[PDB]
Every structure is written in C-alpha cells, then in structure tokens.
Amino acid sequence: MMSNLYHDNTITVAELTKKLASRLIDAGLRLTTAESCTGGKLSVALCAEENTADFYDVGLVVFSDSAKERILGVSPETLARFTAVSEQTVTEMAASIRDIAQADVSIAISGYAGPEGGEDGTAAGTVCFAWNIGGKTETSRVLFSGDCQDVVEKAVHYSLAELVTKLSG
Amino acid sequence: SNLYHDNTITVAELTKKLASRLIDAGLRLTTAESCTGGKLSVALCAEENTADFYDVGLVVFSDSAKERILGVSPETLARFTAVSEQTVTEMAASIRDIAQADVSIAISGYAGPEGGEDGTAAGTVCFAWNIGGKTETSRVLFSGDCQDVVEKAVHYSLAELVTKLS
C-alpha cells in the first residue's frame, strides 16, 4: 500500500530568514536583536541571509543582569519582581535595543537554556520572547525540551517563525 | 610510519584554553564583530562556564552604528574606512567600556564575496585585541568565500588572544 505525496510544512531557519528578509526589505524596515541565552545564534542566522545588509544591522548578546541594566536600561525593580526570564524584562530589552539600533523591529530573548534553571526554581528550558514592531510589543513564555543546544536551536527558530507570521498579511 | 602528533587546534579547544586563562587571571572578555556576524560570540557562549568570563557581545554592520554605539570617529571612517586598524582599535576600546570588561576583541572586515568599494580585496579582515587598555592590531587576508573567511577569522581572533595571554 502507498499513499499521497505529502507536502511537508516544516520551515528551516534559513527559509525563515529568507522570508523575513523579503518582508522587512519590502516594507523598508530595519531589524535588531538582543539575545540572553541563545548566545548570538539568532544574529548568526540573520547575518547568513543573502541580503542581510539591507535589513539587519545591530545584534546584542548579554548574559548578566547588570549588563541588561547598564546597556539596555532594564529596571532593577523589574528584575527584582520578575527576574530576567520574564515577559516584563524582554519587553524592556526589546524597546531599548530598538532605540539603540535606531531600528523599526526588534526581537528580545531571555531564558534558561540549561542545564541549570532559575535560582527561583524556574525550569531549565524556559524562555521568554518579545517582538517590538514599530513600538507595539508582543511577548510569550515557552518551555522547550532537551539540553541547552536543543533549547537554543528551537528558541532561535521560534523567534523567527513568530516574527514572520506577525509581518505577514 | 611512526605516530605523527598533529598540531592543529580547533575553535572548541581554543575557547577552552581561553576560558582557562581568563578565569585564572580574573579577567572578563567582550567582543565586537563587523563581518563575522556573531560567530565569535557563539563560539565563546558554547563554553559551559561562559558566565565566568564572557558577558557582552556586539554585532554591528553599519558605519552609522559604529559611530553612535561605539563612538567610532567619523573622521576615522572617512580617512581609513571601517576596515582599518584605526577603526577596530576604537571599536575594541568602546566595547570594553560598554561591557565593563578587561579584554576585548574587535573584528572588522570584508568577508566577501564583495570587497571594499575602495578596492580592498574580499577576505581582508582587521583585528584589535585590547588587554586592559593596551591594544595590538593585525590586518589579514583570508582565502575562500564568506563562510570560509568568517570561520578562519574567528579561529584567528581566538588563537592570537590565547597566545598573547600565554
């Protein structure tokens, strides 16, 4: 027995950055990123794009709380109440990097890639996301399975896939 | 044939060596990348204990972002372009201030396929290593396409810093 030819609907990171490049360039929009657990993998993906120079300029990688406060102006009371791994913190990260880069769109990621979780007990693999499009911000909180390299891979993909959807009509 | 002891060092071996030297010296590292696209930061964040020696990495493409984020002088860009030892020197000093780090690496080059519009060959990359305010630079031509240039530039930036810290 045999069946239909199946049309697979998985999208690679490279397919996503090509799609995203098209949307941003067509709209005249510039993108910037701030990463706290993916280690620059998001910037690497965006810089691998053929026309990366036409839509992507600034990428920031920051690990510590103090660097988030000093570079990105994240409020210490935000970190005190909600920790760096929260939708509140990535909202502030995304707003600040968008201004520092003079960009139209920003992605912020802050999570625990693993193997260790939060000191507050938050599970390893918990990652928060912010997408700031022209000043309007959406956030999410996701639990990814696997080890740190797995979480980073999936988080990079997830941040891009969501942004592509948000920019599609 | 008698056993040949190979002498090549992978990026993973270099970041372990670099992590060991920075941690033992109580030093922290930051990076600014203008053509390697974050591959240097990714290599440094691949270390388990990256938190003990590495905090901030910056990727920047434009002249504009170099001037307003890193305070690169517009006169420096006009006179020597972004792919110069003068520019990476200023880049390395500023990212160190921003990160409050002890050591910085700055990279600025033309990964390819296009070279400089002023004629500079594709694969030309400038490097600055700032250790506690003392900077050394180099200017290197790498062969291959943009992926080969980036791979070898990341490896070169790490190997030279490991040697200097030895």
From TrEMBL, chain B:
InterPro entries: CinA-like_C (IPR036653), CinA_C (IPR008136). Residues 13-163 form the CinA C-terminal domain. This is Competence damage-inducible protein A.
